Amino acid sequence: TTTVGITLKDAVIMATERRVTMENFIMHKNGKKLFQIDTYTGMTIAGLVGDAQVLVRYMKAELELYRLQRRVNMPIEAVATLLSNMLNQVKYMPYMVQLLVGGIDTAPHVFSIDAAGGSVEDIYASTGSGSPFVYGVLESQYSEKMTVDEGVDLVIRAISAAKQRDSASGGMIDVAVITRKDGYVQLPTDQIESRIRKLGLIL
Amino acid sequence: TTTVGITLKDAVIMATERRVTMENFIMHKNGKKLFQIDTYTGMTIAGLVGDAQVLVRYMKAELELYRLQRRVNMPIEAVATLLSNMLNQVKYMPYMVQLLVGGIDTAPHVFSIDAAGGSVEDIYASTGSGSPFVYGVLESQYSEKMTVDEGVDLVIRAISAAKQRDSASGGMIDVAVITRKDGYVQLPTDQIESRIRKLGLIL
Amino acid sequence: TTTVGITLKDAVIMATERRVTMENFIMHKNGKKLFQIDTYTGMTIAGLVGDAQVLVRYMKAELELYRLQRRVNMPIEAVATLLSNMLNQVKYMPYMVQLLVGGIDTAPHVFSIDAAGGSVEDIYASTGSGSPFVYGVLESQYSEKMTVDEGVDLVIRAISAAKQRDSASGGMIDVAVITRKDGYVQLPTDQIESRIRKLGLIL
Amino acid sequence: TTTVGITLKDAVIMATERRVTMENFIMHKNGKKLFQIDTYTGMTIAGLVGDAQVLVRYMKAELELYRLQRRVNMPIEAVATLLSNMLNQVKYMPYMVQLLVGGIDTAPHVFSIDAAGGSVEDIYASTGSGSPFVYGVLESQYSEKMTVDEGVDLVIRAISAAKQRDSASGGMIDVAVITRKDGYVQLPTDQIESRIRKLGLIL
Amino acid sequence: TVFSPDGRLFQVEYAREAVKKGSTALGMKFANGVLLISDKKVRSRLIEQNSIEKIQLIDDYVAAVTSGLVADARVLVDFARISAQQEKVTYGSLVNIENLVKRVADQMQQYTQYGGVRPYGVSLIFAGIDQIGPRLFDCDPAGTINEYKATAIGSGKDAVVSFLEREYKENLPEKEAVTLGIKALKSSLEEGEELKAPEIASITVGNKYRIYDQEEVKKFL
Amino acid sequence: TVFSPDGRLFQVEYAREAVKKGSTALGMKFANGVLLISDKKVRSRLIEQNSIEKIQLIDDYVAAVTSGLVADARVLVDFARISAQQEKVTYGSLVNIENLVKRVADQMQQYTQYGGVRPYGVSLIFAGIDQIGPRLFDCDPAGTINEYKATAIGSGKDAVVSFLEREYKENLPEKEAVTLGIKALKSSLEEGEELKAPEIASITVGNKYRIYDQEEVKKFL
Amino acid sequence: TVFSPDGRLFQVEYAREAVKKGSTALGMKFANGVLLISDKKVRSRLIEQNSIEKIQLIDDYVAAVTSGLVADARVLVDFARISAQQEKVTYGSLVNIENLVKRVADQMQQYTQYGGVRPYGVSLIFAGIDQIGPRLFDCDPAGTINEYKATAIGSGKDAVVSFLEREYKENLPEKEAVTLGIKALKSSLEEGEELKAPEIASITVGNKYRIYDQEEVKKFL
Amino acid sequence: TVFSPDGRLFQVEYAREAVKKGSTALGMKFANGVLLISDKKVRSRLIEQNSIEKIQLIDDYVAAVTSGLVADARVLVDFARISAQQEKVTYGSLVNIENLVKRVADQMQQYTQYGGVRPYGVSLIFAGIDQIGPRLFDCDPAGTINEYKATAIGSGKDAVVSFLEREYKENLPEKEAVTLGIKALKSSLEEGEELKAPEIASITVGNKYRIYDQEEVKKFL
Amino acid sequence: TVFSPDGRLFQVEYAREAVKKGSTALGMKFANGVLLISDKKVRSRLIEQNSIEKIQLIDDYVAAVTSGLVADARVLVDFARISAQQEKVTYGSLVNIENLVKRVADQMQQYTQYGGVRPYGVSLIFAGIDQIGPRLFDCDPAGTINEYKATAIGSGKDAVVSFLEREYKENLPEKEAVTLGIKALKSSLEEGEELKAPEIASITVGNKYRIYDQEEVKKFL
């Protein structure tokens, strides 16, 4: 699996691929690994599929409830804190996952949460078997000054690089952009395919 | 990880670096390992991040509650005792952490607390993989007569030496000074960066 | 660690050193291992620091309560019996400690208590990694007829010999004298340092 | 440890030594292993000292309670049955002990009880590391026709032989004689010492 | 606690009678802030005045005053303090004070529905700052909640509320809000009774709570 | 709660008296949607209006309005919100709103059969969109449920229902439905009376709920 | 324990009648310290007076004296002793005696709210030294607490309190505080009756409690 | 068991009436010792005399006598026996008998405070030797304790206590103390009524309890 | 089961009325043994005569008879049987029958002290051999026990006891004891009423219990 989240001035961009394996066996070419969990909040999942899927349902439910109760969206750091508590509480019978939570409150944020509930905020982050390849691309190419269009191309390049070198990564790249102005927008596949072409990449 | 706490006549200085690794993989360069937990009390964390972060939350909450209930801050030895009880109670299913608690009540104090709740007060202490390098610097250079300014320089030199020799340590040095006059105060990064320059050091 | 308790005609002398190690790593030079737990009762601790400290807190509290309830101090053998019950009760999830309890009721007593709650009274005893070296000094030099001053010199000689041969032992020697007349008296560091000089000792 | 119990026409004799070891380390030279548990009932202990001491306290308490409730002493076979039930009930988390129970009701009895509550009556029995040496002496020299004075000499000879060959046995021999006429009588140390001298033995 | 033929819960109405006997206290919102003022039936020079305060901090950003049975009130403040910390541990902050007030109110509602317990004889005002802004709520023995710009509890409630209905203005400066509050509290005293020194606490957006000391309160008397 | 000789549960009938004292609210189905309107017992400029929510969202597609004991009602709303989330987690969606209404009603029924508790003094209207279509239900202290094209709860129930009985028609445009609703509510008022701004919320198939702002509500007054 | 129409809890008021029948006890703060004096009902020369004392050490720095049902009082003193030790084990020390008093008062409050138990028929005065300084508290059957400079419980309470309100001075030296307290206690024995040797205990900052023996008490009589 | 308006617990006072119907018993301290004497309600010659004794050893150094409901009494003696053994197991000895008596008295106190149970209809006298010395305590249905030099329970209590108040002095030789106890017990009998042989038991410091045989008792008649 | 003003437990006294209605049975000790005899109030030829006996073996060395509510008695006999087996498993034998009788009596006592249950309407005689010797006890609804040489329960108790108080001699041969027992029982009947075949059981030291067959019983009629 490869997932990525980056922050820009007033934007978060999150992306994943879609390959689901049982060891070397590619069972599903089109799994979903990127989810809207609130108005301005997205999450990516890596690790054990059943565990990650249960947490997505739990987060969608809880953030909806919290929103109705508080009349405002859960702050992104509060999302990461809740997950942190939840995952640490079962650390000896854990959810075997790596999570990125990304969103906009008064500012853009990306958090990376591990299976023991350790949560760290970063300007960008990547999870899954493909993440080392992504971190190479981002280290070399990320700039805090990038436009959303440049950041979208960046995550596409990073995940395409990971697909070339991680056999557990593959399939169509899914991308969402989160802004205060436009909310959570999943980019249409046709748009991502177009950028893949114009960048000289494959799939 | 490298953290340090030193006592001086009427002050406590605590400091850490920020590197978060998984094996050799530097996932985060800007982790936070130094926290204010009460008006005149700070804590550093080393070990399993999820465990440490839960403890920081529990301490922030309990010390605030206690302060409201007692109309006085919890004595620093009481903070260490509380932590000692909590960690020992679960020694067989432990918080996998090493903690420093530093603060001032009628006197400056640093306590070092282990994963079985063993707690020992010292004039200075260090935790994490980089701690032996720190202990070398402090054995050679610490003086109980140092000014706060000299103490800040000392902890910067100690942590810089650890960063040079411990690959699990790195990133910006964070420093807090605790006094009766100003309480816990995290020093601005610009100031730490300025001291690193004038000491002739790196990162 | 090295601790020792000896009985004389109308007195108990207990003593320890102060080194706390993690393997070869000397983390603290000045740990406290000797505690007053009742008016004429002392305790020394060896083994896992967090467990031992919990027991010291439990004993201080319980002996104080018992004194207020009974209007007399708990008999020294009753202190040992209480600890014996508590430690045996959890023997499969134990307090990993060796304890000495010493004091005066109608007579001087030293008891040594193990991690399964086995408790045996003796004329003298020693615990910790340094104890075999102490037992050599005591076998050769102890006399039931010694005066308190002679007994204090003996324990100092014994722990000094242990510090020379046990790398897990070190730091300043703490000594307490317990008598009906004067109660529990921790000797001033200056007095112990002076004895160390006159006896011609080091560390 | 070495303990022994023998029956004679109208008497039971029980005896132990006093050495307490951890491996080869002789921690205590004067432990107690022979106990009066009722008016005409004695018990010896071998195995884990903490476990055995708890059971001594439990038996003293229960036999006193029973005597007060029934207005007669618990029959010796009933003492062994109670012990058998208690030990077997926890056989998977056991008291790691070997016990001898001896006494007089309408007749002399010695019972040997193991860590799983197996309990067998015998005319004589021995427990502890020194027991095989004792069985040698008893097989060769025990006679059902012996006087109390002869039986006391026999057990002293038996334990002395065990002390010569079992490094986990040592110290002063303790002997008790139980009769209807005189009850439980622990023999004075001077008397045992005098017999050791007269029999031409050691320690 | 069961229904009468008219649909009333008399045990809850009676709990509200106990509240009416308590000392008057009030809260009001002002420009970027909120304050509480509490009268006290100080009754003996032998009492320590600085202790068992009417205004109680729930955290640095939220405070409460109560009226009614004083032991019941302490239990509810203890509950509120613990419930605030549970929320802070779970999420990292307390985003909306209304949810804390609801949790306290739900605890009180339970004791009006289950047999084997009597209702709490307590009303509370909660005031503080959260992500929405300065907040002011009251809560009564039934667990009924309302949010206010200004409100009062205790024996002098009706007089204080009437006064405020006429005189209260939004977005006053703190000093002018305190002055108005003191005036409102005075309007509730009986024939020639003198206000001897109330407790005052206030908070403004971006700051923690301030408890006025006796000497500062005196400048308003 | 036991049976009288005629087979009645008087404690439940008395709980129903508490509901009659509550503020008036109504719901009605219209072309591809459903709406709720609630009147508010607002008295005092010192009250915060924005914090008042008689119409409460259960999730993005389901809302409720209640009448009767306000604290009891909050507990049942909280229950409905959690119950809705539990269904959504289990199955991935809420296919039929009737099942949620039944779980809430079962909770209420329980408090009429077991000793040691009193019934909830609450009636609720639930309205939303599920896989069947736009839904409108009510629920009373007994846990009796009915599905409706239009209905009302609270003190003005009888007048509003009579009005709707005469004037309601199916498949109105939203604007016309809201107009009808306002007229229905207005009919329930006494001698020479407005009618301050009520709360209005509506939802249409394929959309989420919308809450009318104070200014859009004014257009109908 | 339920509410009367006037909002009173009669079972608690009745428990307070039992306290009124107890022997008079008082506390007062003086220069860097606090003391307790207790009268005793000596009702037979066959009693050992040196036993079942009215003044009870909670720890070395805190003592209590009680009035009312003696068995209830013993239960509460036992609770206070264990609660003090729990705090000492958890934190290493007892920083503020008020919190211990609150835990005891909460235990008493609970027995006024839950069915199936009666309140404790006990009032207590707690006195000792903590990190704040010398402290003097009382606590009644409701679990109501106050802090004082001087106070009393038991049958003579009103007379002792009247006396002290007139004659009490802060920061007296110990001997003068004791004289005043003896004099106050004597004034509560209205008819020509003699004060037998009361219990006296005192503590000053930096020291542990001391209980005045038989002869030192006599020196004030 | 709840409070009357005068603060009394009538259900406990009624339990005390059951104790007044029991056989008379007494205890007294003498030089380095303590003793108990119990009258016997022996009717039928068909009864086994040596059985169901009113003096009951708790351990070798502690004994009790009871009066009131005999089944209730047995339960409390059983409790005291097990409680004594528990303390002996924990610490290795019973240092102060007062703590055992307090544990028994706490068990009795609990049955006066909680609903669902009636108080024990029993008074006990406990006598023995501990580390303090010879001890003599009584304990009533409320769980009230006192330590005495001499005391009595049961029907003739008031007459026995009057006689002892007139005649008792400390530190008598054992024979003189028994003689005094017998005289005191006879003082409680009706006119012309003979004292049958009571039960007597005594203990002195350094020894275990001894029960007098019928022949030893007869010498005193 | 609570106390009346005179200290009585009427519900227990009323249970004792149920016992008076039962068939008469008796026990007596004789030379090295003890026997039981029970009247059987036969009421129809359609009944199986030999079933649901009044005399029940608890083990081979201990028997009981009962009077009062028969289903209650059955439950207590069942309890006694299981309790005896528990003791024999624990210790290997049943040393003193009085302890067994106390456990049964304690079970009965509990049902006089705790709410939610009524007392057992039963009295029992226990008879057997233990290590002390031949034993004979009775036990009533209060859980009161006594040990006897001879005793009776049931309607004819008073007459049988009167007779034995006159005629009983210790240490009779078995045949002479049975004869006396039959005579005692006959004296409790109404004149004209003839004693039909009673149950007889006996046990001597060193032997197990024997039940007399119908023919050996006749030899005594």
UniProtKB/Swiss-Prot annotation, chains A, B, C, D:
Gene Ontology biological-process entries: proteasomal protein catabolic process
GO molecular function (one): endopeptidase activity
InterPro entries, alphabetized: Ntn_hydrolases_N (IPR029055), Pept_T1A_Psome_bsu_arc (IPR019983), Pept_T1A_subB (IPR000243), Proteasome_bsu_CS (IPR016050), Proteasome_sua/b (IPR001353), Proteasome_suB-type (IPR023333)
Catalytic residues in the record: T1
Alphabetical keyword list: Autocatalytic cleavage, Cytoplasm, Hydrolase, Protease, Proteasome, Threonine protease, Zymogen
SUPFAM superfamilies the record matches: N-terminal nucleophile aminohydrolases (Ntn hydrolases)
Catalyzed reactions per annotation: Cleavage of peptide bonds with very broad specificity
Keyword Cytoplasm: yes
Chief location of this protein within or outside the cell: cytoplasm
Taxonomic superkingdom: Archaea
Location(s), subcellular: Cytoplasm
Hydrolase keyword on record: yes
GO terms under cellular component: cytoplasm; proteasome core complex, beta-subunit complex
UniProt record similarity statement: Belongs to the peptidase T1B family.
PANTHER family: ATP-DEPENDENT PROTEASE SUBUNIT HSLV, METALLOPROTEASE TLDD
Description of how the protein assembles with itself and partners: The 20S proteasome core is composed of 14 alpha and 14 beta subunits that assemble into four stacked heptameric rings, resulting in a barrel-shaped structure. The two inner rings, each composed of seven catalytic beta subunits, are sandwiched by two outer rings, each composed of seven alpha subunits. The catalytic chamber with the active sites is on the inside of the barrel. Has a gated structure, the ends of the cylinder being occluded by the N-termini of the alpha-subunits. Is capped at one or both ends by the proteasome regulatory ATPase, PAN.
The protein, known as: Proteasome subunit beta
Organism: Thermoplasma acidophilum (strain ATCC 25905 / DSM 1728 / JCM 9062 / NBRC 15155 / AMRC-C165)
Curated annotation (Swiss-Prot), chains E, F, G, H, I:
Effect after changing K54A: Prevents PAN to associate with the proteasome and stimulate gate opening
Family statement drawn from the similarity comment of this UniProt entry: Belongs to the peptidase T1A family.
Note, other: The configuration of the closed gate contains an opening large enough to allow rapid entry of tetrapeptides but able to impede the entry of proteins and longer peptides.
This protein's name: Proteasome subunit alpha
Record keywords: Cytoplasm, Proteasome
Cellular localization per UniProt: Cytoplasm
Post-translational events: The N-terminus is blocked.
A GO MF label: threonine-type endopeptidase activity
Cited NCBIfam families: arc_protsome_A (TIGR03633), PRK03996.1 (NF003075)
Residues making up the signal peptide according to the UniProt record: none
Disulfide bonds, paired cysteine numbers: none
GO biological process terms held by the UniProt record: proteasomal protein catabolic process; ubiquitin-dependent protein catabolic process
Source lineage: Archaea, Methanobacteriati, Thermoplasmatota, Thermoplasmata, Thermoplasmatales
Described function: Component of the proteasome core, a large protease complex with broad specificity involved in protein degradation. The T.acidophilum proteasome is able to cleave oligopeptides after Tyr, Leu, Phe, and to a lesser extent after Glu and Arg. Thus, displays chymotrypsin-like activity and low level of caspase-like and trypsin-like activities.
Activity regulation comment: The formation of the proteasomal ATPase PAN-20S proteasome complex, via the docking of the C-termini of PAN into the intersubunit pockets in the alpha-rings, triggers opening of the gate for substrate entry. Interconversion between the open-gate and close-gate conformations leads to a dynamic regulation of the 20S proteasome proteolysis activity.
Recorded GO CC terms: cytoplasm; proteasome core complex, alpha-subunit complex
HAMAP family linked: Proteasome_A_A
InterPro entries: Ntn_hydrolases_N, Proteasome_alpha, Proteasome_alpha-type, Proteasome_asu_arc, Proteasome_asu_N, Proteasome_sua/b
Complex formation: The 20S proteasome core is composed of 14 alpha and 14 beta subunits that assemble into four stacked heptameric rings, resulting in a barrel-shaped structure. The two inner rings, each composed of seven catalytic beta subunits, are sandwiched by two outer rings, each composed of seven alpha subunits. The catalytic chamber with the active sites is on the inside of the barrel. Has a gated structure, the ends of the cylinder being occluded by the N-termini of the alpha-subunits. Is capped at one or both ends by the proteasome regulatory ATPase, PAN.
PROSITE patterns: PROTEASOME_ALPHA_1, PROTEASOME_ALPHA_2
Recorded superkingdom: Archaea
